[PDB]
Every structure is written in structure tokens, then in C-alpha cells.
PDB file of N, CA and C in Angstrom:
ATOM      1  N   UNK A  18      17.057   5.273 -21.283  1.00  0.00           N
ATOM      2  CA  UNK A  18      16.290   6.151 -20.463  1.00  0.00           C
ATOM      3  C   UNK A  18      17.201   7.095 -19.719  1.00  0.00           C
ATOM      4  N   UNK A  19      16.568   8.023 -19.026  1.00  0.00           N
ATOM      5  CA  UNK A  19      17.277   8.892 -18.111  1.00  0.00           C
ATOM      6  C   UNK A  19      16.861   8.637 -16.706  1.00  0.00           C
ATOM      7  N   UNK A  20      17.794   8.781 -15.792  1.00  0.00           N
ATOM      8  CA  UNK A  20      17.477   8.929 -14.388  1.00  0.00           C
ATOM      9  C   UNK A  20      18.127  10.225 -13.846  1.00  0.00           C
ATOM     10  N   UNK A  21      17.626  10.619 -12.690  1.00  0.00           N
ATOM     11  CA  UNK A  21      17.982  11.866 -12.021  1.00  0.00           C
ATOM     12  C   UNK A  21      18.688  11.595 -10.683  1.00  0.00           C
ATOM     13  N   UNK A  22      19.577  12.507 -10.308  1.00  0.00           N
ATOM     14  CA  UNK A  22      20.348  12.399  -9.077  1.00  0.00           C
ATOM     15  C   UNK A  22      20.327  13.754  -8.427  1.00  0.00           C
ATOM     16  N   UNK A  23      19.546  13.832  -7.359  1.00  0.00           N
ATOM     17  CA  UNK A  23      19.467  15.030  -6.529  1.00  0.00           C
ATOM     18  C   UNK A  23      20.690  15.157  -5.606  1.00  0.00           C
ATOM     19  N   UNK A  24      21.379  16.289  -5.695  1.00  0.00           N
ATOM     20  CA  UNK A  24      22.495  16.614  -4.839  1.00  0.00           C
ATOM     21  C   UNK A  24      22.075  17.543  -3.692  1.00  0.00           C
ATOM     22  N   UNK A  25      22.880  17.500  -2.635  1.00  0.00           N
ATOM     23  CA  UNK A  25      22.654  18.360  -1.492  1.00  0.00           C
ATOM     24  C   UNK A  25      22.793  19.836  -1.843  1.00  0.00           C
ATOM     25  N   UNK A  26      23.769  20.151  -2.674  1.00  0.00           N
ATOM     26  CA  UNK A  26      23.953  21.537  -3.043  1.00  0.00           C
ATOM     27  C   UNK A  26      22.720  22.124  -3.783  1.00  0.00           C
ATOM     28  N   UNK A  27      21.910  21.259  -4.416  1.00  0.00           N
ATOM     29  CA  UNK A  27      20.664  21.666  -5.024  1.00  0.00           C
ATOM     30  C   UNK A  27      20.435  21.155  -6.453  1.00  0.00           C
ATOM     31  N   UNK A  28      21.502  21.034  -7.210  1.00  0.00           N
ATOM     32  CA  UNK A  28      21.432  20.748  -8.611  1.00  0.00           C
ATOM     33  C   UNK A  28      20.925  19.305  -8.697  1.00  0.00           C
ATOM     34  N   UNK A  29      20.184  19.031  -9.743  1.00  0.00           N
ATOM     35  CA  UNK A  29      19.765  17.648 -10.046  1.00  0.00           C
ATOM     36  C   UNK A  29      20.505  17.256 -11.348  1.00  0.00           C
ATOM     37  N   UNK A  30      21.266  16.165 -11.313  1.00  0.00           N
ATOM     38  CA  UNK A  30      22.055  15.678 -12.456  1.00  0.00           C
ATOM     39  C   UNK A  30      21.148  14.701 -13.263  1.00  0.00           C
ATOM     40  N   UNK A  31      21.229  14.733 -14.587  1.00  0.00           N
ATOM     41  CA  UNK A  31      20.547  13.763 -15.447  1.00  0.00           C
ATOM     42  C   UNK A  31      21.530  12.851 -16.102  1.00  0.00           C
ATOM     43  N   UNK A  32      21.265  11.568 -16.006  1.00  0.00           N
ATOM     44  CA  UNK A  32      22.193  10.547 -16.525  1.00  0.00           C
ATOM     45  C   UNK A  32      21.462   9.676 -17.529  1.00  0.00           C
ATOM     46  N   UNK A  33      22.156   9.358 -18.609  1.00  0.00           N
ATOM     47  CA  UNK A  33      21.698   8.321 -19.567  1.00  0.00           C
ATOM     48  C   UNK A  33      22.169   6.919 -19.125  1.00  0.00           C
ATOM     49  N   UNK A  34      21.209   6.032 -18.898  1.00  0.00           N
ATOM     50  CA  UNK A  34      21.422   4.715 -18.364  1.00  0.00           C
ATOM     51  C   UNK A  34      20.629   3.631 -19.097  1.00  0.00           C
ATOM     52  N   UNK A  35      21.010   2.401 -18.828  1.00  0.00           N
ATOM     53  CA  UNK A  35      20.357   1.190 -19.303  1.00  0.00           C
ATOM     54  C   UNK A  35      20.182   0.293 -18.089  1.00  0.00           C
ATOM     55  N   UNK A  36      19.264  -0.661 -18.147  1.00  0.00           N
ATOM     56  CA  UNK A  36      18.868  -1.456 -16.977  1.00  0.00           C
ATOM     57  C   UNK A  36      20.022  -2.336 -16.489  1.00  0.00           C
ATOM     58  N   UNK A  37      20.992  -2.612 -17.374  1.00  0.00           N
ATOM     59  CA  UNK A  37      22.138  -3.408 -17.050  1.00  0.00           C
ATOM     60  C   UNK A  37      23.264  -2.618 -16.334  1.00  0.00           C
ATOM     61  N   UNK A  38      23.165  -1.291 -16.306  1.00  0.00           N
ATOM     62  CA  UNK A  38      24.169  -0.527 -15.621  1.00  0.00           C
ATOM     63  C   UNK A  38      24.205  -0.878 -14.107  1.00  0.00           C
ATOM     64  N   UNK A  39      25.411  -1.070 -13.601  1.00  0.00           N
ATOM     65  CA  UNK A  39      25.637  -1.203 -12.184  1.00  0.00           C
ATOM     66  C   UNK A  39      25.568   0.173 -11.505  1.00  0.00           C
ATOM     67  N   UNK A  40      25.381   0.124 -10.200  1.00  0.00           N
ATOM     68  CA  UNK A  40      25.500   1.324  -9.403  1.00  0.00           C
ATOM     69  C   UNK A  40      26.907   1.963  -9.510  1.00  0.00           C
ATOM     70  N   UNK A  41      27.929   1.124  -9.644  1.00  0.00           N
ATOM     71  CA  UNK A  41      29.279   1.564  -9.906  1.00  0.00           C
ATOM     72  C   UNK A  41      29.341   2.375 -11.178  1.00  0.00           C
ATOM     73  N   UNK A  42      28.746   1.829 -12.233  1.00  0.00           N
ATOM     74  CA  UNK A  42      28.626   2.508 -13.535  1.00  0.00           C
ATOM     75  C   UNK A  42      27.919   3.869 -13.347  1.00  0.00           C
ATOM     76  N   UNK A  43      26.833   3.919 -12.558  1.00  0.00           N
ATOM     77  CA  UNK A  43      26.098   5.205 -12.329  1.00  0.00           C
ATOM     78  C   UNK A  43      27.073   6.190 -11.637  1.00  0.00           C
ATOM     79  N   UNK A  44      27.851   5.692 -10.661  1.00  0.00           N
ATOM     80  CA  UNK A  44      28.780   6.576  -9.913  1.00  0.00           C
ATOM     81  C   UNK A  44      29.891   7.055 -10.817  1.00  0.00           C
ATOM     82  N   UNK A  45      30.280   6.213 -11.768  1.00  0.00           N
ATOM     83  CA  UNK A  45      31.237   6.597 -12.791  1.00  0.00           C
ATOM     84  C   UNK A  45      30.677   7.729 -13.692  1.00  0.00           C
ATOM     85  N   UNK A  46      29.404   7.632 -14.085  1.00  0.00           N
ATOM     86  CA  UNK A  46      28.777   8.681 -14.849  1.00  0.00           C
ATOM     87  C   UNK A  46      28.684  10.016 -14.057  1.00  0.00           C
ATOM     88  N   UNK A  47      28.366   9.931 -12.764  1.00  0.00           N
ATOM     89  CA  UNK A  47      28.365  11.095 -11.891  1.00  0.00           C
ATOM     90  C   UNK A  47      29.798  11.688 -11.850  1.00  0.00           C
ATOM     91  N   UNK A  48      30.817  10.867 -11.695  1.00  0.00           N
ATOM     92  CA  UNK A  48      32.182  11.389 -11.727  1.00  0.00           C
ATOM     93  C   UNK A  48      32.512  12.129 -13.040  1.00  0.00           C
ATOM     94  N   UNK A  49      32.081  11.598 -14.170  1.00  0.00           N
ATOM     95  CA  UNK A  49      32.248  12.313 -15.467  1.00  0.00           C
ATOM     96  C   UNK A  49      31.532  13.672 -15.564  1.00  0.00           C
ATOM     97  N   UNK A  50      30.415  13.848 -14.853  1.00  0.00           N
ATOM     98  CA  UNK A  50      29.654  15.082 -14.854  1.00  0.00           C
ATOM     99  C   UNK A  50      30.184  16.068 -13.838  1.00  0.00           C
ATOM    100  N   UNK A  51      30.446  15.579 -12.620  1.00  0.00           N
ATOM    101  CA  UNK A  51      30.640  16.388 -11.442  1.00  0.00           C
ATOM    102  C   UNK A  51      32.062  16.378 -10.857  1.00  0.00           C
ATOM    103  N   UNK A  52      32.864  15.381 -11.202  1.00  0.00           N
ATOM    104  CA  UNK A  52      34.217  15.231 -10.682  1.00  0.00           C
ATOM    105  C   UNK A  52      34.269  14.565  -9.328  1.00  0.00           C
ATOM    106  N   UNK A  53      33.149  14.017  -8.825  1.00  0.00           N
ATOM    107  CA  UNK A  53      33.168  13.386  -7.534  1.00  0.00           C
ATOM    108  C   UNK A  53      33.628  11.918  -7.736  1.00  0.00           C
ATOM    109  N   UNK A  54      34.712  11.490  -7.066  1.00  0.00           N
ATOM    110  CA  UNK A  54      35.043  10.099  -7.151  1.00  0.00           C
ATOM    111  C   UNK A  54      33.967   9.170  -6.606  1.00  0.00           C
ATOM    112  N   UNK A  55      33.746   8.034  -7.263  1.00  0.00           N
ATOM    113  CA  UNK A  55      32.744   7.021  -6.888  1.00  0.00           C
ATOM    114  C   UNK A  55      32.871   6.578  -5.382  1.00  0.00           C
ATOM    115  N   UNK A  56      34.123   6.399  -4.951  1.00  0.00           N
ATOM    116  CA  UNK A  56      34.577   6.282  -3.539  1.00  0.00           C
ATOM    117  C   UNK A  56      33.819   7.085  -2.534  1.00  0.00           C
ATOM    118  N   UNK A  57      33.570   8.320  -2.931  1.00  0.00           N
ATOM    119  CA  UNK A  57      32.938   9.314  -2.054  1.00  0.00           C
ATOM    120  C   UNK A  57      31.456   9.474  -2.227  1.00  0.00           C
ATOM    121  N   UNK A  58      30.887   8.678  -3.118  1.00  0.00           N
ATOM    122  CA  UNK A  58      29.466   8.768  -3.377  1.00  0.00           C
ATOM    123  C   UNK A  58      28.695   7.703  -2.652  1.00  0.00           C
ATOM    124  N   UNK A  59      27.655   8.107  -1.976  1.00  0.00           N
ATOM    125  CA  UNK A  59      26.670   7.170  -1.465  1.00  0.00           C
ATOM    126  C   UNK A  59      25.362   7.480  -2.164  1.00  0.00           C
ATOM    127  N   UNK A  60      24.778   6.481  -2.880  1.00  0.00           N
ATOM    128  CA  UNK A  60      23.509   6.744  -3.569  1.00  0.00           C
ATOM    129  C   UNK A  60      22.373   6.085  -2.775  1.00  0.00           C
ATOM    130  N   UNK A  61      21.252   6.790  -2.631  1.00  0.00           N
ATOM    131  CA  UNK A  61      20.091   6.334  -1.896  1.00  0.00           C
ATOM    132  C   UNK A  61      18.854   6.408  -2.803  1.00  0.00           C
ATOM    133  N   UNK A  62      17.980   5.442  -2.659  1.00  0.00           N
ATOM    134  CA  UNK A  62      16.719   5.380  -3.394  1.00  0.00           C
ATOM    135  C   UNK A  62      15.758   4.589  -2.518  1.00  0.00           C
ATOM    136  N   UNK A  63      14.554   5.149  -2.322  1.00  0.00           N
ATOM    137  CA  UNK A  63      13.509   4.569  -1.443  1.00  0.00           C
ATOM    138  C   UNK A  63      14.084   4.244  -0.063  1.00  0.00           C
ATOM    139  N   UNK A  64      14.902   5.143   0.476  1.00  0.00           N
ATOM    140  CA  UNK A  64      15.384   5.000   1.828  1.00  0.00           C
ATOM    141  C   UNK A  64      16.551   4.059   2.040  1.00  0.00           C
ATOM    142  N   UNK A  65      17.062   3.407   0.975  1.00  0.00           N
ATOM    143  CA  UNK A  65      18.122   2.402   1.059  1.00  0.00           C
ATOM    144  C   UNK A  65      19.397   2.793   0.273  1.00  0.00           C
ATOM    145  N   UNK A  66      20.546   2.493   0.862  1.00  0.00           N
ATOM    146  CA  UNK A  66      21.832   2.654   0.184  1.00  0.00           C
ATOM    147  C   UNK A  66      21.931   1.678  -0.924  1.00  0.00           C
ATOM    148  N   UNK A  67      22.255   2.148  -2.121  1.00  0.00           N
ATOM    149  CA  UNK A  67      22.439   1.261  -3.297  1.00  0.00           C
ATOM    150  C   UNK A  67      23.858   0.668  -3.384  1.00  0.00           C
ATOM    151  N   UNK A  68      23.950  -0.630  -3.575  1.00  0.00           N
ATOM    152  CA  UNK A  68      25.208  -1.304  -3.604  1.00  0.00           C
ATOM    153  C   UNK A  68      25.811  -1.305  -5.013  1.00  0.00           C
ATOM    154  N   UNK A  69      27.116  -1.133  -5.025  1.00  0.00           N
ATOM    155  CA  UNK A  69      27.848  -0.861  -6.236  1.00  0.00           C
ATOM    156  C   UNK A  69      27.733  -1.935  -7.292  1.00  0.00           C
ATOM    157  N   UNK A  70      27.729  -3.202  -6.857  1.00  0.00           N
ATOM    158  CA  UNK A  70      27.717  -4.351  -7.728  1.00  0.00           C
ATOM    159  C   UNK A  70      26.381  -4.808  -8.259  1.00  0.00           C
ATOM    160  N   UNK A  71      25.305  -4.143  -7.856  1.00  0.00           N
ATOM    161  CA  UNK A  71      23.973  -4.461  -8.316  1.00  0.00           C
ATOM    162  C   UNK A  71      23.608  -3.503  -9.415  1.00  0.00           C
ATOM    163  N   UNK A  72      22.670  -3.951 -10.223  1.00  0.00           N
ATOM    164  CA  UNK A  72      22.205  -3.206 -11.366  1.00  0.00           C
ATOM    165  C   UNK A  72      20.949  -2.380 -11.079  1.00  0.00           C
ATOM    166  N   UNK A  73      20.728  -1.436 -11.961  1.00  0.00           N
ATOM    167  CA  UNK A  73      19.486  -0.668 -11.971  1.00  0.00           C
ATOM    168  C   UNK A  73      18.258  -1.621 -12.051  1.00  0.00           C
ATOM    169  N   UNK A  74      18.329  -2.587 -12.947  1.00  0.00           N
ATOM    170  CA  UNK A  74      17.341  -3.646 -13.050  1.00  0.00           C
ATOM    171  C   UNK A  74      17.136  -4.414 -11.753  1.00  0.00           C
ATOM    172  N   UNK A  75      18.189  -4.733 -11.009  1.00  0.00           N
ATOM    173  CA  UNK A  75      18.078  -5.431  -9.718  1.00  0.00           C
ATOM    174  C   UNK A  75      17.257  -4.618  -8.730  1.00  0.00           C
ATOM    175  N   UNK A  76      17.415  -3.306  -8.761  1.00  0.00           N
ATOM    176  CA  UNK A  76      16.710  -2.401  -7.895  1.00  0.00           C
ATOM    177  C   UNK A  76      15.377  -1.915  -8.523  1.00  0.00           C
ATOM    178  N   UNK A  77      14.972  -2.486  -9.665  1.00  0.00           N
ATOM    179  CA  UNK A  77      13.741  -2.057 -10.364  1.00  0.00           C
ATOM    180  C   UNK A  77      13.716  -0.556 -10.519  1.00  0.00           C
ATOM    181  N   UNK A  78      14.886   0.051 -10.704  1.00  0.00           N
ATOM    182  CA  UNK A  78      14.887   1.478 -10.986  1.00  0.00           C
ATOM    183  C   UNK A  78      14.599   1.684 -12.473  1.00  0.00           C
ATOM    184  N   UNK A  79      13.523   2.423 -12.727  1.00  0.00           N
ATOM    185  CA  UNK A  79      13.113   2.806 -14.053  1.00  0.00           C
ATOM    186  C   UNK A  79      13.364   4.234 -14.390  1.00  0.00           C
ATOM    187  N   UNK A  80      13.085   4.549 -15.636  1.00  0.00           N
ATOM    188  CA  UNK A  80      13.350   5.862 -16.137  1.00  0.00           C
ATOM    189  C   UNK A  80      12.636   6.917 -15.329  1.00  0.00           C
ATOM    190  N   UNK A  81      13.288   8.071 -15.181  1.00  0.00           N
ATOM    191  CA  UNK A  81      12.766   9.230 -14.493  1.00  0.00           C
ATOM    192  C   UNK A  81      12.656   9.046 -12.950  1.00  0.00           C
ATOM    193  N   UNK A  82      13.300   8.017 -12.418  1.00  0.00           N
ATOM    194  CA  UNK A  82      13.435   7.865 -10.981  1.00  0.00           C
ATOM    195  C   UNK A  82      14.472   8.870 -10.473  1.00  0.00           C
ATOM    196  N   UNK A  83      14.353   9.276  -9.222  1.00  0.00           N
ATOM    197  CA  UNK A  83      15.306  10.189  -8.645  1.00  0.00           C
ATOM    198  C   UNK A  83      16.066   9.484  -7.503  1.00  0.00           C
ATOM    199  N   UNK A  84      17.389   9.414  -7.673  1.00  0.00           N
ATOM    200  CA  UNK A  84      18.297   8.976  -6.620  1.00  0.00           C
ATOM    201  C   UNK A  84      18.756  10.246  -5.841  1.00  0.00           C
ATOM    202  N   UNK A  85      19.181  10.026  -4.609  1.00  0.00           N
ATOM    203  CA  UNK A  85      19.798  11.056  -3.764  1.00  0.00           C
ATOM    204  C   UNK A  85      21.221  10.722  -3.603  1.00  0.00           C
ATOM    205  N   UNK A  86      22.035  11.708  -3.923  1.00  0.00           N
ATOM    206  CA  UNK A  86      23.452  11.586  -3.705  1.00  0.00           C
ATOM    207  C   UNK A  86      23.849  12.181  -2.354  1.00  0.00           C
ATOM    208  N   UNK A  87      24.575  11.397  -1.577  1.00  0.00           N
ATOM    209  CA  UNK A  87      25.132  11.867  -0.318  1.00  0.00           C
ATOM    210  C   UNK A  87      26.618  11.746  -0.446  1.00  0.00           C
ATOM    211  N   UNK A  88      27.320  12.851  -0.203  1.00  0.00           N
ATOM    212  CA  UNK A  88      28.768  12.788  -0.157  1.00  0.00           C
ATOM    213  C   UNK A  88      29.131  12.212   1.148  1.00  0.00           C
ATOM    214  N   UNK A  89      29.997  11.249   1.114  1.00  0.00           N
ATOM    215  CA  UNK A  89      30.527  10.673   2.337  1.00  0.00           C
ATOM    216  C   UNK A  89      32.030  10.690   2.217  1.00  0.00           C
ATOM    217  N   UNK A  90      32.669  11.661   2.872  1.00  0.00           N
ATOM    218  CA  UNK A  90      34.126  11.802   2.838  1.00  0.00           C
ATOM    219  C   UNK A  90      34.781  10.549   3.471  1.00  0.00           C
ATOM    220  N   UNK A  91      34.102   9.961   4.467  1.00  0.00           N
ATOM    221  CA  UNK A  91      34.336   8.531   4.914  1.00  0.00           C
ATOM    222  C   UNK A  91      33.459   8.065   6.076  1.00  0.00           C
ATOM    223  N   UNK A  92      33.251   8.913   7.077  1.00  0.00           N
ATOM    224  CA  UNK A  92      32.213   8.714   8.075  1.00  0.00           C
ATOM    225  C   UNK A  92      31.024   9.598   7.738  1.00  0.00           C
TER     226      UNK A  92
END
């Protein structure tokens, strides 16, 4: 399936994923598209920060869901 990642700058990124992908894996895919290190990515869905070690399946994220990317330089 695909999921979407809305950025602050405006662009929405489309990623090819599977339910077993970790949030880390999603951030790795964003880095391949956008050049943003996973370090600096905070992903949000339904108002909650997504943790790196959990899967898309753990968060019941299905195809065509939209995550929000927040850049966090550190604070």
C-alpha cells in the first residue's frame, strides 16, 4: 500500500509500505526521498508522536492514511 506524509513546507510525500514496516523504516524512506535524517523527523498521526520501534500494524495505520511530519532540529 501507500501512505502519505504531509510536510510543513506543503508537499505531501507518498511512500510504499507494508504493515511490518517500523516507524524507523518509514523515516528511512522519507530520508531517501527528501534527505531529512530520521534523527530530525517527528511523525504524528491522530494527535500522537509515533515511536520508532513500533510498526505500522501496531498503530493500525492503513493504506492512504496521512502522517504529519514535524522537523525537530532538537527542541
